[PDB]
Design a protein around this nucleic acid. Structure first.
Lengths: 178, 1306
DNA sequence: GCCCTTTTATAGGCCGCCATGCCGGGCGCCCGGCCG
DNA sequence: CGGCCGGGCGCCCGGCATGGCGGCCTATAAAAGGGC
């Protein structure tokens, strides 16, 4: 069994369950940004933990920047409490997490060409625009970015076990190329 | 734009904050010079209060503050009436103030006065004076000099563009905080009458402030708590205003508040500045309790954070006049505090502290009892555990608050304290102690544990053991946990921690923090457990005895060290030391029996050794084309691994391999492969040597680490050995070589106890051995006791300065640096050892053990108090190092001397003061530092000795060996005492300076550095206090030093001095002032730079001063015949084209000055080799100087002056090298500006002035100049800039006093 | 349906200009020769 | 003694070459609602 990846970011989908006047909020506090001419969501940051929030007028939000599930949740709840402080009622109704990002590092460099040829049906190497091998896998549905310094980044997971599995699957192929 | 505009725009565009601070200081100085400029200054800086930047608004506000602070109070000789304020106008009629919207171009385009009137009308609208939430389309010296500016500031209080709020709040604050008493006054009404007008004006201000304090709800939730961007600023401004307010007005405002509160921080900002009125009025102190009654239970945490901050000053006189509210306050406090699941407790700590200081009083015990009489739920017996969940909160300040509050509750005493002294807190506090990182929390917590366990033991140690036993063994096992190395941790099983972050400690992630911090976490638990271990009955200790036995026997390395210190704690509290006799054979075997085959803690090192060796072993013989399974290979199993076999790989196996397998490999790979593989074989041998030596050194050091604590334990139990050699030698070795500072701090006490134990036993022999070794070790560091056999030959050398010159060349290899760091560690241990052994005996110190006194006196009195025999002054002798050794001991032992031993050091004082003049510098080096130490510590007597004998003869020319020390001692004094020399300026500053002007190589340098550090030390902004406890004969009205310090600190304090000589050109007042400064420099052998504008009559001042000094030298020689004023010509350096100019000027002003120009045909320049002395003045171009410098340098000169010195700036040019050779009694530098926006310019110049004042390029570049320049760059960085500019000003201070800059307008 | 924004790993190139390091043209100055 | 000149140098400042360290752009994951 190969070494496990290390988790580095979490994206969360959170349900406020209330319609909001976005324009008003923008002028209400300093810590936010919102312009339809720029983007749909309200962009807001808090420090504890360092996070960014996309909030949508219909009553949902996408939350970013947590290292851990519990941290993520805590951040989300704090956001919701902030919302409550703003003056328009809201609740921490729903919580979902998608595309948990992790990274792994191994000694040997990876022969991108050889791998790409092995899984040509599933992988493509294009050093003309990105110095990495995108390796696509099905079970679990995971997007693997394979880099030539022995580094693999795992994306699209819901749970750490997924990335674990992904790495376990890819790791023998790695060992074939050093 | 004007220069004033440049000074103002720097407040926005200043590269550094400090330059902007200098800008506002200049603006305030201009206001001081020109008070009429006040309002122009304000109107120019005020617009920046609307600027976007946080810092720019802050800087403009501070500029206003400094400007008004330099303005006088005003004295001659429409208002919203305060009672009109009501809830409706704010809550349901006022316009909210929030984020600024798009710019109001339609209104901004109008004139400022018309715009002000329109803004006033719209402000009347905004406040809710109209009975509706209106729309903008409905409104599309005889008097207070600041009135219009005040009106603009007040109107700015309600701008939607929130930057204006933050800036203008601070601006109006800067107006009213300084000139609040004078606000609003107008002629006609007399002072007593217009006091009421001032009252009305301040009431109007408070009215508008209260309107702001809820109309504006602008907020920033970025921070989890401090969401107040501009509410806090306006509230603090109101607090600043409040100090001027009349008492009845305070009552009215207080009513408005306490109705508004049901702006809460406004209650705090009035409790700041009218606490007296709250008590005197009686009722009004009700509001502070009522606010916490209303608020302290609120869901909103944005005001929970504020509510505590109001209450601290209250409950002192309250307890008499409003006793009833005390119980309610504490009960509501504990109810809110118990809101488990809430995520912030910042104000909770302050409330806990307030309760804690209250808990020191019996009235608060009664407050507890009166509420407890109704219910046990609020009782002190059952309440306290609601503190328990807070022990591991993330913010450290509240942790400290928890600790101290717990301590105060422990101080409450009484039988009721048994309600929570149950074992729950006993386990929880220890669980806090085990892993805590923060030092302050550890410091408090050890005390808390001690007090607590003592309280419980006071009933019975049996019930203490009952409280602890159910949790005892797992806790002890946690206390005996191992310790590891980076990237190979050993975590702890979290099942052992009872419930009521921490992850780095639970996982054992030593990478984050140095292992010393882990050892701190271990000794904390050690000391916590030791007291309880000693207190509880011995029969209960069987399991504990087995646990410590395992820790002593365990293969884990750390456990033996932990166990040894554990037994040390156990012994040091025992009723009789023989109670610990059951630990005699284990610890003595730990120091005696051979240390193990393997250390489990070191297992990772062994694996690293195996891998780093096998990667070469498998490499090279395979590179010899021979690989076979039976050939030598290191075993798969590594000794120390879990369940490893006896035959597992060990370091001895590696030693066996590398011993003979290398030549075996060479013979095996003989045919060709050896030749191509030999360099690789060389670096492989090097790598194997490195790793093997590393592992062996680690093992040996760890052996010492265990043995040191073991010896500490054995000493502690007072079971003194009958064959003391191993114990004492292990103690000495540990003290010399211990790597951890905490174990060193322990070993110091170990030896300090051991000496007294030997004294009690009467075996002075081993005591003499150990103390002799101890003092002997103190000389190891090369910077503290130089090697006599190395430096012995040097004579007429300023030996201490060699650290500046040549000691930096030593680090040529790692072998030197290794011993250097070893020396540092050795002295670090030695200082603690000698310190504790000094303190413990104190006044009887020299009496108890005489041998230390013998070592302290005998060499100094055997060698000095006489003259050195030929062998004693032989550089290869035996006795030579001994003298410097004893002097080292004296200069180390001094500051830890007890006061009663002072006669001893004062008896030593006669020896050193005479020895200081000796021929052999190697003794002078030790004497200098020793004298500095005596002077620093025993202040009065050392100062008397120094000033009375060392100093007064400093000017005598005959005795050079005395002359060198006469300044070297002063330098070491300035180093050792630091700024504490400053009161002693009245015995040094002039005579030490006079050393600069005497021609003696090395002496000239040390003097310059001493004077430079003195110049740094003198304050730029403070005077000189009286020297403390100095006899009148010392002082004796020596005001010459005072005059020198005054004139050094300020040129305006220099006396006038008209031309004594008959120069035809009379001095104008500016010329006279320049002559005054030049005389002041000329009056004390200083040198400096003159930088007057050329229109001020440049040459006249210089030629006047040199002619004046020429005449003074001539007449003094006629009166005295002294050598010091010997006849020499003056030498001037100038551009060649200027030569004639200068010549003609000399003839004009001073025809009595004869002139020789070192110019003309090369023949004639070759011809005039000796003639040069025939005229008073010598004229020289730069370039004829640069050629014939070999020629020109023969004679000394009176004055050496650079006419156009700018050319000299280069630190390497041959001209610069050329000029510097010359020697004289005076010299000056003439330039347009010395510091023209570049700091790098100056070094060369300064050197030319004073070799050794600023120091060499080795410190000027590296330390200051380079980083200065770097950080100064805009593109460089953001962090260092402020520190850089502070350093810039430091350079300005160091270089200012010897520079004189004057503008032509002056 | 394509493109818009967010955040985290990432890797190398694409471009950028600051301080840095440089040294050639030219400065001022000297000066050995020869002129009168 | 008095002078002009070609040849002379250490040395400073300008234009130049140049690279450290920097955003930006690729991959480009995955919500969401949005613009068009």
């Amino acid at each position: 069994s190969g070494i496990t990846p290390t988790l580095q970011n979490i994206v969360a989908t959170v349900n406020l369950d209330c319609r909001l006047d976005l324009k008003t909020i923008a002028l209400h506090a300093r810590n936010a940004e919102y312009n339809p001419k720029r983007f749909a969501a309200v962009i807001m940051r808090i420090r504890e933990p360092k996070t960014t929030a996309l909030i949508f007028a219909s009553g949902k939000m996408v939350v970013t920047g947590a290292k851990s599930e519990d941290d993520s949740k805590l951040a989300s709840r704090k956001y919701a409490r902030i919302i409550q402080k703003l003056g328009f009622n809201a609740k921490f109704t729903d919580f979902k997490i998608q595309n948990i990002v992790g990274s792994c590092d191994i000694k040997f460099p990876i022969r991108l060409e050889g791998l790409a040829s092995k899984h040509h049906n599933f992988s493509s190497y294009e050093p003309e625009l990105f110095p990495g091998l995108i390796y696509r896998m099905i079970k679990p549905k995971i997007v693997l970015l394979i880099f030539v310094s022995g580094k693999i980044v795992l994306t699209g997971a819901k749970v750490r076990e997924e990335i674990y599995q992904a790495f376990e699957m890819i790791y023998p192929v790695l060992q074939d190329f050093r | 734009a004007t220069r004033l505009d440049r000074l103002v725009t720097i407040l926005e565009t200043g590269s550094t904050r400090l330059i902007r601070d200098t800008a506002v200081n200049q603006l305030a100085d201009w206001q001081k010079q020109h008070p009429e400029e006040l309002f122009n200054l304000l109107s120019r800086v005020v617009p920046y209060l609307r600027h976007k930047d946080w810092e720019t608004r802050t800087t403009a506000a501070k500029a206003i503050g400094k400007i008004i602070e330099n303005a006088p109070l005003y004295d001659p000789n429409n208002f919203f009436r305060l009672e009109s304020l009501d809830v409706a106008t704010i809550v349901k009629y006022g316009r909210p103030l929030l984020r600024g919207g798009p710019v109001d171009y339609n209104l901004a385009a109008l004139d400022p006065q018309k715009r002000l009137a329109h803004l006033k009308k719209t402000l009347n609208g905004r406040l809710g004076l109209l009975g509706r939430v209106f729309e903008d389309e409905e409104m599309p010296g005889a008097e207070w000099p600041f009135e219009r500016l005040c009106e603009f500031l007040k109107v700015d209080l309600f701008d939607p563009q929130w930057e204006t709020r933050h800036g203008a709040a601070m601006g109006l604050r800067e107006v009213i905080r300084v000139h609040g008493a004078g606000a609003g006054r107008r002629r006609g009404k007399t002072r007593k009458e217009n006091n009421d007008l001032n009252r009305q004006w301040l009431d109007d201000l408070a009215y508008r402030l209260l309107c702001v304090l809820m109309l504006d709800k602008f907020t920033d939730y970025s921070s989890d708590t401090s969401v107040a961007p501009i509410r806090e600023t306006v509230g603090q401004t109101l607090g600043a205003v409040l100090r001027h307010i009349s008492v009845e007005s305070v009552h009215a405002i207080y009513r408005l508040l306490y109705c508004m509160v049901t702006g809460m921080v406004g209650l705090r900002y009035v409790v700041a500045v009218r606490k007296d009125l709250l008590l005197q009025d009686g009722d009004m102190i009700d509001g502070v309790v009522r606010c916490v009654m209303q608020g302290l239970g609120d869901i909103d945490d944005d005001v929970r954070s504020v509510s505590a901050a109001t209450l601290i000053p209250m409950a002192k006189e309250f307890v008499m006049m409003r006793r009833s509210a005390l119980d309610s306050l504490i009960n509501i406090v504990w109810e809110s505090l118990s809101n488990l699941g809430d995520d912030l407790s910042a104000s909770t700590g302050k409330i806990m502290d307030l309760l804690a200081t209250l808990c020191s009083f019996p009235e608060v015990l009664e407050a507890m009892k009166v509420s407890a009489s109704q219910d046990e739920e609020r009782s002190f017996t059952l309440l306290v555990p609601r503190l328990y969940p807070f022990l591991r909160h993330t913010i450290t300040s509240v942790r400290l608050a928890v600790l101290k509050a717990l301590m105060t509750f422990a101080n409450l005493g009484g039988e009721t304290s048994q309600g929570w002294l149950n074992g729950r807190i006993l386990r929880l506090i220890f669980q806090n102690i085990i892993v805590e990182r923060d030092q302050d929390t550890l410091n408090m917590s050890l005390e808390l544990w001690t007090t607590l366990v003592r309280r419980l033991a006071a009933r019975d140690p049996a019930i203490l053991a009952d409280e602890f036993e159910a949790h005892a063994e797992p806790m002890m096992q946690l206390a005996l946990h191992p310790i590891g190395v980076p990237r190979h941790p050993i975590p702890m099983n979290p099942a052992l921690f009872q419930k009521p972050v921490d992850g780095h400690m639970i996982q054992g992630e030593v990478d984050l923090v140095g292992v010393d911090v882990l050892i701190r976490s271990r000794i904390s638990a050690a000391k916590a457990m030791g007291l309880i271990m000693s207190f509880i009955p011995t029969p209960r200790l069987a399991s504990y005895d087995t646990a410590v036995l395992q820790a002593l026997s365990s293969p884990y390395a750390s456990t033996q060290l932990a166990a040894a210190m554990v037994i040390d704690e156990y012994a040091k509290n025992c009723s009789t030391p023989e109670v610990a006799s059951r630990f005699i054979e284990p610890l003595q075997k730990i120091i005696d029996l051979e240390r193990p085959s393997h250390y489990r803690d070191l297992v990772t090192y062994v694996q690293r050794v195996r891998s780093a060796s096998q990667q070469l072993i498998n490499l090279f013989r395979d590179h010899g084309k021979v690989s076979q399974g039976k050939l030598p290979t290191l075993a798969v199993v590594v000794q120390g691994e879990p369940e490893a076999g006896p035959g597992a790989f060990s370091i001895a196996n590696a030693e066996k391999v590398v011993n003979e397998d290398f030549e075996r490999l060479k013979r095996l790979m003989a045919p060709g492969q050896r030749l191509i593989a030999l360099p690789q074989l060389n670096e492989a041998r090097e790598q194997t040597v490195e790793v093997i030596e590393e592992a062996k050194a680690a093992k040996e050091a760890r052996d010492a680490r265990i043995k040191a604590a073991a010896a500490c334990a054995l000493v502690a139990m007072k079971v003194l050995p009958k064959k003391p050699s191993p114990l004492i030698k292990a103690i000495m070795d540990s003290i010399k070589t211990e790597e951890n500072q905490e174990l060193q701090s322990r070993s110091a006490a170990t030896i300090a106890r051991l000496v007294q134990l030997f004294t009690e036993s009467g075996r002075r022999g081993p005591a003499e051995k150990v103390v002799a070794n101890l003092v002997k070790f103190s000389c190891v560091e090369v910077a503290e006791t130089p090697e006599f056999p190395i430096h012995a030959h040097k004579t007429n050398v300023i030996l201490s300065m060699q650290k500046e010159e040549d000691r930096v060349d030593h680090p040529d290899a790692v072998k030197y640096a290794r011993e250097a760091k070893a020396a540092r560690i050795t002295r670090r241990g030695a200082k603690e050892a000698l310190e504790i052994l000094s303190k413990n005996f104190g006044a009887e110190l020299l009496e108890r053990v005489p041998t230390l006194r013998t070592f302290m006196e005998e060499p100094l009195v055997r060698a000095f108090s006489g003259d050195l025999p030929p062998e004693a002054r032989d550089p290869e002798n035996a006795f030579g190092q001994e003298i410097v050794d004893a002097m080292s001991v004296i200069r180390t032992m001094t500051p830890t001397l007890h006061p009663a031993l002072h006669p001893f050091v004062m008896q030593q004082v006669p020896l050193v003061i005479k020895a200081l003049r000796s021929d052999l510098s190697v003794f002078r080096y030790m004497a200098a530092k020793c004298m500095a130490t005596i002077c620093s510590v025993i202040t009065v007597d050392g100062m008397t000795a120094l000033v009375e004998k060392v100093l007064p003869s400093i000017n005598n020319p005959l005795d050079l060996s005395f002359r060198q020390g006469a300044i070297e001692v002063i330098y070491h004094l300035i180093a050792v005492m630091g700024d504490a020399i400053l009161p002693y300026v009245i015995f040094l500053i002039v005579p030490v300076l006079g050393r600069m002007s005497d021609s003696d190589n090395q002496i000239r340098l040390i003097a310059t550095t001493s004077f430079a550090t003195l110049v740094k030390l003198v304050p730029l902004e403070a005077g000189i206090p009286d020297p403390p406890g100095l006899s009148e004969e010392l002082l004796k009205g020596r005001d010459r030093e005072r005059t020198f310090i005054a004139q050094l600190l300020d040129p305006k304090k220099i006396e006038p001095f008209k031309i004594p000589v008959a120069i035809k050109a009379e001095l104008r007042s500016y010329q006279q002032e320049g002559v005054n400064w030049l005389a002041f420099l000329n009056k004390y052998h200083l040198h400096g730079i003159l930088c007057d504008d050329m229109g001020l009559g440049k040459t006249l001042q210089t030629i006047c001063i040199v002619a004046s000094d020429h005449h003074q030298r001539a007449e003094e020689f006629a009166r005295t015949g002294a050598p010091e004023v010997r006849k020499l010509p003056s030498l001037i350096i100038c551009p060649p084209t200027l030569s004639g100019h200068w010549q003609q000027e000399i003839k004009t002003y001073a025809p009595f000055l004869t002139v020789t120009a070192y110019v003309g045909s090369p023949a004639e320049r070759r011809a005039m080799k000796d003639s040069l002395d025939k005229t008073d003045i010598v004229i020289t171009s730069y370039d004829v100087c640069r050629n014939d410098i070999d020629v020109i340098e023969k004679y000394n000169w009176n004055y050496c002056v650079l006419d156009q010195g700018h050319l000299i700036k280069n630190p390497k040019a041959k001209i610069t090298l050329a000029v510097k050779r010359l020697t004289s009694n005076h010299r000056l530098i003439l330039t347009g500006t010395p510091i023209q926006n570049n700091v790098l310019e100056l070094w060369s110049l300064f050197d030319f002035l004073m070799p050794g004042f600023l120091g060499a390029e080795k410190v000027f570049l590296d330390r200051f100049a380079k980083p200065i320049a770097n950080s100064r760059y805009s593109k460089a960085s953001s962090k260092e800039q402020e520190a850089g500019a502070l350093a810039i000003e430091a350079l300005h201070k160091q270089v200012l006093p010897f520079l004189l800059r004057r503008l032509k307008e002056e």
